[PDB]
């Protein structure tokens, strides 16, 4: 479970970075 | 942007499945 | 923890619904 | 759309904090 949670966290960090970028492009 | 958002959607689909699985394990 | 996980799942379900909508608007 | 994406970002910020907290509890 620890490893699963770490992977989900890394995904959400990526989402924050990606959505902040889209925000800027818009 | 559309391709990006598709990838995010796919991630969230995986997150719901994994977190639901974790919730049952616990 | 169970309740926290359920809330995160509900958020991600909303994200899927919202991003599918944005997808369509774009 | 920009307002929507901001709300998603805010959610993911909460998710990273909560999942990290869960990861420590476990
Ligand atoms: Zn996310
Ligand atoms: Zn960038
Ligand atoms: Zn997620
Ligand atoms: Zn999400
Ligand atoms: Zn709608
Ligand atoms: Zn999330």
Tab-separated table of C-alpha atoms in Angstrom, chain A residues 1 5, chain B residues 19 22-23 26, chain C residues 1-9, chain D residues 18-19 21-26:
chain	number	residue	atom	x	y	z
A	1	UNK	CA	0.000	0.000	0.000
A	5	UNK	CA	0.262	5.726	-2.235
B	19	UNK	CA	-7.852	3.835	-3.656
B	22	UNK	CA	-6.770	0.126	-0.669
B	23	UNK	CA	-9.999	0.946	1.126
B	26	UNK	CA	-7.790	-1.745	5.104
C	1	UNK	CA	-8.342	6.880	7.053
C	2	UNK	CA	-11.354	5.122	5.467
C	3	UNK	CA	-13.302	8.366	5.435
C	4	UNK	CA	-10.359	10.297	4.027
C	5	UNK	CA	-9.975	7.791	1.192
C	6	UNK	CA	-13.662	7.988	0.377
C	7	UNK	CA	-13.402	11.715	0.079
C	8	UNK	CA	-10.412	11.557	-2.226
C	9	UNK	CA	-12.271	9.036	-4.429
D	18	UNK	CA	-3.720	13.904	2.849
D	19	UNK	CA	-2.109	10.883	1.149
D	21	UNK	CA	-0.338	12.058	5.984
D	22	UNK	CA	-1.954	8.605	5.465
D	23	UNK	CA	1.390	7.230	4.347
D	24	UNK	CA	2.950	8.332	7.622
D	25	UNK	CA	0.082	7.012	9.767
D	26	UNK	CA	0.487	3.598	8.081
